[PDB]
Amino acid sequence: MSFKREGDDWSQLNVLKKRRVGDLLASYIPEDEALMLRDGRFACAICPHRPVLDTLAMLTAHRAGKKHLSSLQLF
Amino acid sequence: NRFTVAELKQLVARPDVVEMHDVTAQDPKLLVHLKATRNSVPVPRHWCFKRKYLQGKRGIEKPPFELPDFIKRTGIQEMREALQEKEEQKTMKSKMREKVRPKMGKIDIDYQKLHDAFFKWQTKPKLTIHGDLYYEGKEFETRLKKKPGDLSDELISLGMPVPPPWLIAMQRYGPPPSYPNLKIPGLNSPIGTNAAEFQTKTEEEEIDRTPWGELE
Amino acid sequence: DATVYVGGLDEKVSEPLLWELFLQAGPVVNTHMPKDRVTGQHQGYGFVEFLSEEDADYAIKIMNMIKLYGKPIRVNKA
Ligand SMILES: [Zn+2]
């Protein structure tokens, strides 16, 4: 398996996929807007009640939503 | 049909425990009797709060867990930190290639050091006595409140030989109204006669302090 | 009177020290001594909530006793 690679570890590949999705989506979120918690979750720092969201995919989908946009323009 | 708080408070043997809603109880006499019994711990305070327990904005910024000291003495944290700092640089090719040609003896701490961490350097942590229930703000409101007649070393800022500078004026302005029973030297406390401190000396001479039944 | 306003302080002075300073007179139940975030330093004025009136009445007198870093401190009702 050294000379030509054999097989693939689909669980670790899925871990890598989660990292690459995270890096991609994170580069479009400015550093003030998102606060990363101790366990790897994310809070929205715009919205006054700080909702906490499990992934960066959910944080991006939140930042699309109308509650966030209304809370955004006040800040 | 039901008591108001004043009748209930007089009917208790001890009226400091009664709250607004205890009158709404189906048996309020027994409830305030049980709240004033010794060594019982009160109902957790968030039973009436609308927000869920520990789901609060201050809890967002909690820092990571810290290891105890006797474990950081092993050097586990520096080794494993370096290790996972290399492993984010590797590609999937390289990781799957060292899974067919492994690398022995990498992250090894000698057994004697690990045994000593657990069987020699272990220290008991700070523990809490019974009835000290955790609530949500607790670890920030843990500063408490130090009484007049007891000074801190730092309050060094005064730099005065040992009585208090303010007292030279408390005798002038009077004893403060807020404290009815406070006692300070020169006003109503001996610097009459001063035999109070001699009592503590004589008693302290009297005592044997040898704990019975300890290890030799 | 439960609260007092305290002026004219030096930032080395601290809220915990301040609590011990005024509890020398009588216990400060609620302490407030602003931390300014922008330049990370204190302007030196304070607000103190006590148990009841007792702490407040003493308050003004407590000011005379106080002397931080060779300087006085304003205490008045609020
Ligand atoms: Zn938001």
Curated annotation (Swiss-Prot), chain A:
Q: Where is this cross-link: Glycyl lysine isopeptide (Lys-Gly) (interchain with G-Cter in SUMO2)?
A: K67
Annotated motif Bipartite nuclear localization signal, positions? 4-20
Modified residues annotated as Phosphoserine in this record: S2
Tell me the domain of life. Answer: Eukaryota
* Location of the protein in the cell: Nucleus, Nucleoplasm; Nucleus speckle
Zinc finger regions (Matrin-type), where?
42-74
Query: What disease is recorded for this protein?
Result: Orofaciodigital syndrome 19: A form of orofaciodigital syndrome, a group of heterogeneous disorders characterized by malformations of the oral cavity, face and digits, and associated phenotypic abnormalities that lead to the delineation of various subtypes. OFD19 is an autosomal recessive form characterized by tongue nodules, dental and digital anomalies, narrow high-arched or cleft palate, and retrognathia. Some patients have notching of the upper or lower lip.
Quote the subunit structure annotation.
Answer: Component of the minor spliceosome, which splices U12-type introns. Within this complex, interacts with RNF113A, as well as with SF3B1/SF3b155, SF3B2/SF3b145, SF3B3/SF3b130 and CDC5L. May interact with LUC7L2 and SNRNP70.
**Biological role:** As a component of the minor spliceosome, involved in the splicing of U12-type introns in pre-mRNAs. Plays a role in the regulation of primary cilia length and Hedgehog signaling.
Name of the protein in its database record: Sodium channel modifier 1
The species this protein belongs to is Homo sapiens (Human)
* Designated gene of the protein: SCNM1
Which residues of the parent chain are present? 1 to 75 of 230
UniProtKB/Swiss-Prot annotation, chain B:
* UniProt region (Required for interaction with PRMT9), positions on chain: 1-93
Task: Describe the effect of R73K.
Answer: Does not affect methylation by PRMT9
Output the PTM entry.
Methylation at Arg-51 by PRMT9 is required for the interaction with SMN1.
Listed A to Z, the keywords are: Acetylation, Coiled coil, Disease variant, Host-virus interaction, Isopeptide bond, Methylation, mRNA processing, mRNA splicing, Nucleus, Phosphoprotein, Spliceosome, Ubl conjugation
Q: Which compartments is it annotated to reside in?
A: Nucleus; Nucleus speckle
Effect of mutating K52A: Moderately diminished formation of omega-N monomethylarginine but greatly reduced formation of symmetrical dimethylarginine
Please give the name of this protein: Splicing factor 3B subunit 2
Q: What is the source species?
A: Homo sapiens (Human)
Encoding gene (name) = SF3B2
Q: Which residues of the full protein are shown?
A: 458 to 712 of 895
Curated annotation (Swiss-Prot), chain C:
Of which family is this protein a member? Belongs to the SF3B4 family.
Q: Where in the cell is it found?
A: Nucleus
From the UniProt record, report the name of the gene that encodes this protein. SF3B4
Could you say which disease the record links this protein to?
Acrofacial dysostosis 1, Nager type: A form of acrofacial dysostosis, a group of disorders which are characterized by malformation of the craniofacial skeleton and the limbs. The major facial features of AFD1 include downslanted palpebral fissures, midface retrusion, and micrognathia, the latter of which often requires the placement of a tracheostomy in early childhood. Limb defects typically involve the anterior (radial) elements of the upper limbs and manifest as small or absent thumbs, triphalangeal thumbs, radial hyoplasia or aplasia, and radioulnar synostosis.
Phosphotyrosine-modified residues are where? Y45
Cite the record's note on assembly.
Component of the 17S U2 SnRNP complex, a ribonucleoprotein complex that contains small nuclear RNA (snRNA) U2 and a number of specific proteins. Part of the SF3B subcomplex of the 17S U2 SnRNP complex. SF3B associates with the splicing subcomplex SF3A and a 12S RNA unit to form the U2 small nuclear ribonucleoproteins complex (U2 snRNP). SF3B4 has been found in complex spliceosome 'B' and 'C' as well. Component of the minor (U12-type spliceosome) spliceosome. Found in a complex with PRMT9, SF3B2 and SF3B4.
Q: What is this protein called?
A: Splicing factor 3B subunit 4
The RRM domain sits at 2-78
Q: What does this protein do?
A: Component of the 17S U2 SnRNP complex of the spliceosome, a large ribonucleoprotein complex that removes introns from transcribed pre-mRNAs. The 17S U2 SnRNP complex (1) directly participates in early spliceosome assembly and (2) mediates recognition of the intron branch site during pre-mRNA splicing by promoting the selection of the pre-mRNA branch-site adenosine, the nucleophile for the first step of splicing.
